Design a protein around this ligand. Structure first.
Ligand SMILES: *[C@@H]1O[C@H](CO)[C@@H](O[C@@H]2O[C@H](CO)[C@@H](O[C@@H]3O[C@H](CO)[C@@H](O)[C@H](O[C@H]4O[C@H](CO)[C@@H](O)[C@H](O)[C@@H]4O[C@H]4O[C@H](CO)[C@@H](O)[C@H](O)[C@@H]4O)[C@@H]3O)[C@H](O)[C@H]2NC(C)=O)[C@H](O)[C@H]1NC(C)=O
Ligand SMILES: *[C@@H]1O[C@H](CO)[C@@H](O[C@@H]2O[C@H](CO)[C@@H](O)[C@H](O)[C@H]2NC(C)=O)[C@H](O)[C@H]1NC(C)=O
Ligand SMILES: *[C@@H]1O[C@H](CO)[C@@H](O[C@@H]2O[C@H](CO)[C@@H](O)[C@H](O)[C@H]2NC(C)=O)[C@H](O)[C@H]1NC(C)=O
Ligand SMILES: *[C@@H]1O[C@H](CO)[C@@H](O)[C@H](O)[C@H]1NC(C)=O
Ligand SMILES: *[C@@H]1O[C@H](CO)[C@@H](O)[C@H](O)[C@H]1NC(C)=O
Ligand SMILES: *[C@@H]1O[C@H](CO)[C@@H](O)[C@H](O)[C@H]1NC(C)=O
Ligand SMILES: *[C@@H]1O[C@H](CO)[C@@H](O)[C@H](O)[C@H]1NC(C)=O
Ligand SMILES: *[C@@H]1O[C@H](CO)[C@@H](O)[C@H](O)[C@H]1NC(C)=O
Ligand SMILES: *[C@@H]1O[C@H](CO)[C@@H](O)[C@H](O)[C@H]1NC(C)=O
Ligand SMILES: *[C@@H]1O[C@H](CO)[C@@H](O)[C@H](O)[C@H]1NC(C)=O
Ligand SMILES: *[C@@H]1O[C@H](CO)[C@@H](O)[C@H](O)[C@H]1NC(C)=O
Lengths: 97, 365, 133, 121, 133, 30
């Protein structure tokens, strides 16, 4: 139950993190359980959400466990809750602009 | 001579995590870059594989926690690193908020070399055995009803593709919908075929502009086969519609195989587009020289493409989908890219166990 | 490989049968069993020859490490062998007809594996104290 | 670990006694013919371990000379047992016993096998 | 593999023979205990004489072990560590009190003791195992 | 008369042909 605030447009870096340093598979979903952003091996993938063109991630940090989510062009309608599922640690971070 | 015996030769097995060895059928004079690797890293396959069928045995297989998937995935990274040497290899290093991540650029001698995969076996060592689920309806997990023992599995071709599991092996009953847990929207639904939908990929005489022709007849009935046994998982009222990929990296939003050393990128957009109430299509394929490596996190940059025709006929014997959790209609926009799924979908019916042939039991001696 | 690697796998036949049925097969299976290119002719003789001899001597030293362990207990070469250790009745507390008539070795070994280290200590000690006095 | 154990065995009393006494570039020439002399030894180990399981089923494991409780039949080449060790080679046995060695191996199975149940009672 | 255990016997030297035979029971369980690089055609026949030379050792460690337990198996017991047989101890073989042997002597002392008689016992162990059969 | 002479054609260069001595050896176990 983390708290993250933005203004508008800016890049927020939500973060889930494991303890392995070996690029394990994660995902990122929202409150309606639609995929936001996902890892598939060594490639990135999106999901058919309404953040599909705006979401991003930092590719070089996956090899150290850190699996961020970087969102551009913050509207008002993305003020929701987001869920990172590494292997079990379904951490929820909520967002507001 | 009273009450505790020992026997040597009891049929007991406990599951293990050994190191299997390759054992492929290499040719040792070719310079096709698999027969080079399979010469100095494998043994010749045995002519007579002794296969003992087990009777009235119910082993509890698993494929989403299999280990020999990992020993394949390390041998195949070791294959590609000695076969397809890139001219420029841009792998990061990354040695808080932002740790120092320098992106090193190893360059090396990079000729063009022939590259078509051969079937690799995987033979267990002495004192172990490989169990094999001979049931033709296996869900992937759970108690397999019929098991057989075998030194190694069938000749597995280490192809590498996303969105489509080409040249692979094919099911026998109708089409299997193997996954881990279909409520999650985060596990790749593997799908096998019982029919090889052929695909004809060519570069004719732009040198980076190809096309791949797949029949509308064979693809409409094979999408017809899959769509029946999905409403047996999500209810008979869901009007499930296939769809385009959702976005993301270029190697997973497009059918990224390779052929003859050259890394094609097709466009399966007219291939998954059909709603389903309860001739040959063409695919706009490119050839990239700047690919993302699937081995590690990196980027490679290869030589210019070769001159000539590059015809690449292959069997689509598998899909990898991904469901979409709606509010309702379940849309299956495909995916892939984790290369362990091309080897989970061909090492699912296997399990390596450790034979412990010593046993105790009481009687009256 | 082509030696005593088939013997360790041939033990695993008739799993799922009853323990009397495996015992009948014990003594009888160990009675019945135990390119025009000069470059390929080189590797087939030299490095594919070594790598199959590193697996035939692995199956030998896997076998002698088993028949040595039966040598501490006293048997050492008898496939069926019974000792002087008395069966403790707190070892699964099961009926002797319930065990040998309807139970498979896999089902049996899952029952006993709580304490098979404790049985293995007694058979060494009893063969240490039957050669002491 | 013997596959040969020869020592030029000719006379049987000398063959029995000595048996208890005795057995108690240019890199391509030498690597191909070194593996051939390891396939000789490693087979001659696995031929021993296969054989010592066969004597173990008859009860005669490990002992080179062993005596056992199966007498001759009448049709098992009845010659005098004093001249048999005098003037005969060991080679002349397998000529002299032809099809009896398969049923001798069967009778030596049951002689141990009935004995394992006899001492059981 | 086996050549590891051939030297592990020496861990009990310097102790007394009653203690070293007891350590041997623990040592009985303690005696129950890769070139995959890119090889050029110059490295091919050079890393294979490195293969055969190590594999002429692993088979010698097996063939020495079977030449031991062929000699034990003549003297009645094959695979037994502690094995006592049915020959009476002659008095002329360096007569001493049995408490003056297992309590105040190391095993190396017995090399100095009865090596003048060690061949004579070996023929007796053959004959009595031949006279009893 | 169920037999028929199948002609098989191939390339056919000119070769040198003298034989070398060849030693027949036995495998392990013989
Ligand atoms: C699924 O499996 C199938 C079956 O294996 C795979 O399809 C095979 O694909 C390979 C190439 O990817 C193809 O091999 C070619 O066959 C041609 C027919 O004889 C050969 O002529 C050709 O050799 C040339 O191409 C190589 C490519 O670089 C060169 O290295 C080689 O030296 C030859 O090069 C000459 O010709 C080229 C012009 O092509 C010229 O530029 C050169 O200078 C030189 O003159 C290949 O051997 C097989 O024929 C295909 N099999 C079938 C049945 O069609 C398929 O790839 C697999 N799919 C996946 C995804 O893995
Ligand atoms: C499959 O995965 C999901 C999540 O791990 C599980 O299904 C959901 O479980 C949560 C609790 O963890 C419930 O609140 C949801 O209601 C479940 N989903 C549905 C659609 O009911 C499910 O338990 C997993 N299945 C297995 C076999 O592990
Ligand atoms: C792959 O092909 C599809 C069409 O088969 C492309 O998708 C769009 O298709 C519509 C017609 O249905 C065109 O009008 C658009 O121009 C296409 N593009 C977009 C961005 O909408 C698709 O673009 C092709 N793949 C790639 C990577 O370009
Ligand atoms: C697969 O089927 C087996 C029965 O063979 C069942 O036990 C298991 O729960 C099923 N699993 C999934 C993920 O469908
Ligand atoms: C595919 O088949 C279904 C029924 O089998 C039919 O409704 C549909 O129109 C077909 N589509 C094509 C492109 O043939
Ligand atoms: C869907 O239909 C099949 C037969 O076509 C039936 O067996 C199954 O029970 C149905 N599913 C339901 C009612 O949930
Ligand atoms: C998928 O198809 C839709 C609709 O045709 C199109 O707008 C989109 O750009 C396509 N995306 C990809 C990645 O093919
Ligand atoms: C496709 O599968 C068929 C058997 O269904 C096989 O004979 C053929 O060789 C395969 N095509 C390939 C491997 O290109
Ligand atoms: C399988 O089970 C039946 C019923 O218990 C049993 O009679 C049969 O012997 C078993 N199969 C085998 C091959 O033993
Ligand atoms: C037997 O071992 C298992 C773990 O392997 C343990 O959970 C169980 O409690 C043990 N049972 C007894 C009776 O010791
Ligand atoms: C060969 O025959 C001679 C004459 O009988 C005999 O003295 C000699 O010992 C024999 N050779 C062997 C090896 O026994």
């Amino acid at each position: 139950k983390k708290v993250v605030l933005g203004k508008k447009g800016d890049t927020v870096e939500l973060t889930c993190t494991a303890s392995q340093k070996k690029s394990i598979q994660f995902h990122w979903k929202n409150s309606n359980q639609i995929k936001i952003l996902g890892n598939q091996g060594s490639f990135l993938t999106k999901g058919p959400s309404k953040l599909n063109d705006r979401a991003d991630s930092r590719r070089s940090l996956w090899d150290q466990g850190n699996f961020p989510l970087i969102i551009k062009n913050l509207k008002i309608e993305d003020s929701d809750t987001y869920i990172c599922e590494v292997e079990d640690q379904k951490e929820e971070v909520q967002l507001l602009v | 001579n009273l009450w505790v015996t020992v026997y040597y030769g009891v049929p007991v097995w406990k599951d293990a995590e050994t190191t299997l060895f390759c054992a492929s059928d290499a040719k040792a004079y070719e310079t096709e870059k698999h027969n080079v690797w399979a010469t100095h890293a494998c043994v010749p396959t045995d002519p007579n594989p002794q296969e003992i069928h087990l009777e009235n045995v119910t082993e509890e297989f698993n494929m989403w926690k299999n280990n020999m998937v990992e020993q394949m995935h390390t041998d195949i990274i070791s294959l590609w690193d000695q076969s397809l040497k890139p001219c420029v290899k841009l792998t990061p290093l990354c040695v808080y908020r932002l740790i120092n991540c320098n992106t090193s650029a190893i360059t090396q001698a990079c000729p063009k070399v022939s590259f078509e995969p051969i079937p690799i076996h995987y033979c267990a060592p002495a004192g172990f055995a490989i169990l094999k689920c001979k049931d033709k309806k296996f869900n992937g997990t759970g108690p397999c009803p019929s098991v057989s023992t075998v030194q190694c599995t069938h000749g597995i071709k280490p192809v590498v593709s996303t969105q489509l599991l080409l040249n692979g092996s094919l099911a026998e009953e109708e089409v299997m919908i193997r996954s881990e847990n279909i409520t999650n929207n985060a596990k790749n639904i593997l799908v096998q075929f019982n029919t090889p939908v052929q695909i004809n990929c060519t570069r004719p005489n732009d040198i980076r502009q190809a096309h791949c022709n797949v029949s509308k007849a064979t693809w409409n009935e094979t999408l017809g086969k899959v769509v029946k046994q999905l409403r047996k998982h999500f209810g008979n009222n869901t009007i499930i519609r296939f769809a385009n990929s959702s976005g993301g990296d270029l190697e997973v939003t497009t059918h990224s195989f390779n052929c003859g050393g050259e890394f094609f990128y097709c466009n399966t957009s007219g291939l998954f587009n059909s709603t389903w109430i309860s001739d040959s299509i063409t695919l706009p394929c490119r050839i990239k020289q700047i690919i993302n490596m699937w081995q590690r996190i990196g980027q490679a940059m290869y030589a210019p493409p070769i001159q000539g025709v590059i015809r690449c006929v292959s069997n689509i014997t598998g899909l990898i989908l991904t469901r979409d959790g709606g509010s309702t209609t379940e849309t299956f926009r495909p995916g892939g890219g984790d290369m362990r799924d091309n080897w989970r979908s061909e090492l699912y019916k296997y399990k390596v166990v450790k034979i412990e042939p010593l046993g105790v039991a009481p009687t009256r001696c | 490989a082509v030696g005593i690697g088939a013997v360790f796998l041939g033990f695993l036949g008739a799993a799922g049968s009853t323990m009397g049925a495996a015992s009948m097969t014990l003594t009888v299976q160990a009675r019945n069993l135990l390119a025009p290119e000069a470059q390929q002719h080189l590797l087939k003789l030299t490095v594919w020859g070594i790598k199959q001899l590193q697996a035939r001597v692995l199956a030998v030293e896997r076998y002698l490490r088993d028949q040595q362990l039966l040598g501490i207990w006293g048997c050492s070469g008898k496939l069926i062998c019974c000792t002087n250790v008395p069966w403790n009745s707190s070892w699964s507390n099961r009926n002797l007809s319930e065990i040998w008539d309807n139970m498979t070795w896999l089902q049996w070994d899952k029952e006993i594996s709580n304490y098979t280290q404790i049985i293995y200590g007694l058979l060494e000690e009893s063969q240490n104290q039957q050669e002491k006095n």
